[PDB]
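Hi team,

Filling in the usual template for the complex we talked about on Friday. All components are listed, including any nucleic acid strands or ligand strings, so the model treats them as one assembly.

SUBMITTER: L.P.
PURPOSE: interface mapping
COMPONENTS: three
RESIDUES: 319
SEQUENCES:
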Amino acid sequence: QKENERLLRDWNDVQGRFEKCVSAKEALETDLYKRFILVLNEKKTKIR
Amino acid sequence: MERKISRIHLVSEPSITHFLQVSWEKTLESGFVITLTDGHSAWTGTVSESEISQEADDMAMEKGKYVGELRKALLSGAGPADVYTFNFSKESCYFFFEKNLKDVSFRLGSFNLEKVENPAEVIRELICYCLDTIAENQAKNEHLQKENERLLRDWNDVQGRFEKCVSAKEALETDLYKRFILVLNEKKTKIRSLHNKLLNA
Amino acid sequence: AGSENIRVKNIILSNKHDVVKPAWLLECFKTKSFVPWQPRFMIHMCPSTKEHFAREYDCYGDSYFIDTDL
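RESULT (copied from the run log):
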């Protein structure tokens, strides 16, 4: 009983740090694309 | 309904393990039936609530505290500092049981007993019960093992994967920036093209 | 300016001057050569720099400046 409850709370804490890592990942994603490439789309307005 | 059986040794029989069985309804104070045996013969007695009141009020004690003591003594609730001792004469069918402190004994209580005419029958009953009890814990332990297995697998899996994910997260950005900076040069190419065309015309 | 002050702001508020971040001159010094300036190196500037922003005479704002670095 003690052993597997320990297994479980590591399991869950790993889930949590997984999600925080994922969230950092998502932030980095957005930071550069969705309208950060406006550095290009306004190179496109310069082209116009 | 509570039953509790206890392996004991009478002082009269150091080499014989005697077995103290207790049956009672959640509460030893209300009264109980007691059975003793040694594998060839068995005995039974009975005690009532008022007997315990009388015992506890001759203990100079609050009833209930003496009941906790009884839980320690007869239901094996005794601790390491607890040294109870049991005495019974099969000839007189008189039991009593005591407590050892100050290098001395203190008779806690004492019961009128009687030899049972059917030792083997109470024996079958007790031990069938015990078999059942064994078996239950066995099955429980089995299941517990199974889920211990499952969790130990899952923990390793998720740990390795989380590490790999952290690795890729650190890997991503340079991929992205190489991918850009070339396109950014290329649009700078198109820019310089149209700009030189504008200066020419 | 290594760091701002309200005088920075003043000369920021007085755009008659072009206000420069420190590392680029170190860059120029480490280049042993004047590296010509662009928004890589600045905080804020009079518009004449901005008409320069082609590395020549034809734009005005930002959401643009980078030379293919990381």
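MY TAKE: Chain B is about 50% helix and 25% strand. Chain B touches chain A through 25 residues (CB under 8 Å).

Thanks, L.
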